[PDB]
DNA sequence: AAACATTCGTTCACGTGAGTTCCAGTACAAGTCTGGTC
DNA sequence: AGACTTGTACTGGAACTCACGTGAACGAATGTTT
């Protein structure tokens, strides 16, 4: 019912539970479509930019800016991209280092005065831009789609998190802009639009 | 009187169960990095 | 919000050792039979 009502989950409480400040779970629990496996629709999209990390992840790429591809003419590959959102979490340290090494040599500095033709940005400009012909397809378990004025697509993902840097799929198998619009209109925002059967 | 068995009696090797030390794997709390909007 | 890293604790499995039990080789001594 919560999913059908476009809600954000449910909360379960024990009748005998007592109030204990600063306790992460003593009788109060939260059930959301994110936790259940398979209910959400994973979003696989390309990587078009990266940013330098801060703190422990100093000398490496900590977060990345991803873009969806447009609809090319029949028999032609997509050469135009629109930025969707930014992903910083979901990748382990070893996987993050491997991804950085895989694209360390292909990284190219980004200049605001001369934005790349292949990648078109909105208000957020990546520090380093990478051309699309050589990139990995990152999978993100987005919670919902909200209207964003900082990206060309006009929409962004709430609580984005990387799930896997897929290697089987190539750079040309990313989502299309029409596919993104269809997904947005499927449930008017929240991606969780599937019931649970057991 | 000699040979066999038998016996028999022993003892050694091998196998199974209980206690002790060490380390791999798992659960929980907190720090740390990162996402977006007004 | 979320996910990963760090720590802390906590436990169960593996390896080692010893005690108990058993099987069975065998070696020789003795008794019986021819």
What is the rounded distance in angstroms from the CA atom of residue A131 to the CA atom of residue A96? 19
A90 touches strand C (CB under 7 A): yes
Report yes or no: A102 and A27 within 8 Å, Cβ to Cβ: no
Residue carrying the six token digits 């984005």: A160
Q: Are A148 and A155 in contact (CB under 8 A)?
A: yes
A59 in contact with nucleic chain B (CB within 7 A):
no
Question: Phi, psi (5° rounding) for residue A167?
Answer: -105, -25
User: In angstroms, what CA-CA distances link A52 with A1, A89, A91, A109, A146?
Assistant: 42, 14, 15, 12, 26
Three-state SS for chain A is CCCCCCCCCEEEECCCCCCCCCCCCCCEEEECCCCCCCCCCCEEEEEEEEEECCHHHCCCEEEEEEEEECCCCCCCCCCCEEEEEEECCCCCHHHHHHHHHHHHCCCEECCCCCCCCCEECCCCCCCEECCCCCCCEEEECCCEEEECCCCCCCEEEECCCEEEEECCCCHHHCCEHHHHHHHHHHHCCCCCCCCCCC
Question: Is the CB of residue A23 less than 8 Å from the CB of residue A30?
Answer: no
Strand B within 7 A of A83 CB: no
Count CB neighbours of A172 within 10 A: 14
Q: Which nucleotides of C are covered by protein (CB under 7 A)?
A: 1-5
CB A165 within 8 A of CB A177: no
> Which residues 156-175 in chain A have a CB closer than 7 A to strand B?
156-160
**CA dihedral sign, ordered A41, A142, A161, A110:** positive
Please name the residues in contact with A183: beta carbons below 8 A apart, sequence gap of 6 or more. A41, A43, A145, A175, A191
C-alpha closest to that of A189 among A147, A152, A153: A147
- Report how far residue A173's alpha carbon sits from residue A91's, in angstroms, rounded to the nearest whole number: 21
Taking every pair of Cα atoms in chain A, the longest distance, rounded to a whole number of angstroms, is 65
Q: By what technique were these coordinates determined?
A: cryo-EM
User: Are residues A73 and A93 in contact, defined by beta-carbon separation less than 8 angstroms?
Assistant: no
| CA A153 – CA A145 distance, rounded (Å) | 11
């Amino acid at each position: 019912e919560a999913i059908d009502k476009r809600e954000e989950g449910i909360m379960v409480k024990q009748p005998l539970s007592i109030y204990k400040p600063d306790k992460r779970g003593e009788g109060w629990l939260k059930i959301k479509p994110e936790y259940v496996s398979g209910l959400m629709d994973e979003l696989d999209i390309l990587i078009v930019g990266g940013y330098w990390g801060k703190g422990s992840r100093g000398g490496m790429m900590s977060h990345f800016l991803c873009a969806v591809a447009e609809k090319p003419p029949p028999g032609e590959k997509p050469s135009v991209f629109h930025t969707l959102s930014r992903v910083g979490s979901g990748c382990t340290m070893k996987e993050l280092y491997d991804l950085g090494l895989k694209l360390a040599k292909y990284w190219k500095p980004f200049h605001r005065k001369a934005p790349p033709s292949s990648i078109l940005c909105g208000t957020e400009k990546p520090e380093v831009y990478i051309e699309p012909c050589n990139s990995v397809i990152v999978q993100i378990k987005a919670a919902e789609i909200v209207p964003s004025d900082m990206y060309k697509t006009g929409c962004t993902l709430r609580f984005p998190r990387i799930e896997k840097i897929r290697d089987d799929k190539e750079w040309h198998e990313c989502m299309t802009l029409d596919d993104l619009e269809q997904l947005r209109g499927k449930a008017s925002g929240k991606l969780a639009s599937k019931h649970l059967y057991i």
